């Protein structure tokens, strides 16, 4: 019994939606990382362009 | 009563066709109701001093 949740393609042998459950949420926490570097820099370099 | 009584209902849904659950169950855990505090506020109490 190779462990599910710790290697891939054993989750997927038992749950095929679990891969597209994974690359639907790595996208919304890599695009939300870009949304917290761009918006962060747009308020870290914002007042740094004031004074 | 619950065996003979059902007999008025096993050949009643026979001609009408359900899955009526004449078998019984224990008490289910209670359903999520939606309690009401119309007007007032919950009355505040607190335990009383020790006097003999």
């Amino acid at each position: 019994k190779k462990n599910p949740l710790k290697n891939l393609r054993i989750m997927l042998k038992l749950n095929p939606y679990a891969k597209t459950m994974r690359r639907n949420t790595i996208l919304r926490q890599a695009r939300n990382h870009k949304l917290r570097v761009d918006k962060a820099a747009a308020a870290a370099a914002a007042l740094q362009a004031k004074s | 009563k619950r065996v003979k009584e059902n007999d008025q209902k096993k050949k009643e849904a026979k001609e009408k066709g359900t899955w009526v659950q004449l078998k019984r169950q224990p008490a289910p855990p209670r359903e999520a109701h939606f309690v009401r505090t119309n007007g007032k506020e919950p009355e505040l109490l607190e335990p009383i001093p020790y006097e003999f």
Binding site: - | P42, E43, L44, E46, P47, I48, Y50
Partner: protein, 175 residues
């Protein structure tokens, strides 16, 4: 109740099951201090069953939320009321402390009644914790901290042993 760790102030409201004899029971309310939300909804049904004909298999609660302070950084004078058991009898007691929130005072009461009167945290019943303002405090131990332009030094300072040279050639000085 163990009062393990810091305490926490819960509000619990609660009523009893809808009867044929009476609809809409009044849904009473308390203010429980407990280290998590399970002990709050287990001492709630302790203080209720001493005061009404409600017991936990004949009544349900609808709300157990952490109620917490409106000024966590404003120093306050707390004055509370106890009902602790002693060995010989049980006793009504007033008591004051000085901390930044009510859960910082009732924690300091169980640590105080444990120190001075050997009461374990199961035999003790809070009646009501509210602040009073300054210059209404009865306790003279708290009362001396109510003076602006206060100054006192730090005499005889010692800590952090074995941290340095468990074996050194430099005598420590109190300072």
């Amino acid at each position: 109740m163990k009062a393990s760790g810091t305490l926490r102030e819960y509000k619990v409201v609660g009523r009893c099951l809808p009867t044929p004899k009476c609809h809409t029971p009044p849904l009473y309310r308390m203010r429980i201090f407990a280290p998590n939300h399970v002990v709050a909804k287990s001492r709630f049904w302790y203080f209720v069953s001493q005061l009404k004909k409600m017991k936990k298999s004949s009544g349900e609660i609808v709300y157990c939320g952490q109620v917490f302070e409106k000024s966590p950084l404003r120093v306050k004078n707390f004055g509370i009321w106890l009902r602790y058991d002693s060995r010989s009898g049980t006793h009504n007691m007033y008591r004051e402390y000085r901390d930044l929130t009510t859960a910082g005072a009732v924690t300091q009461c169980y640590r105080d009644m444990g120190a001075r009167h050997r009461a374990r945290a199961h035999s003790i019943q809070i009646m009501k914790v509210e602040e009073i303002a300054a210059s209404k405090c009865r306790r003279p131990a708290v009362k001396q901290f109510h003076d602006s332009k206060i100054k006192f030094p730090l005499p005889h300072r010692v800590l952090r042993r074995q941290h340095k040279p468990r074996f050194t050639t430099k005598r420590p000085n109190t300072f």
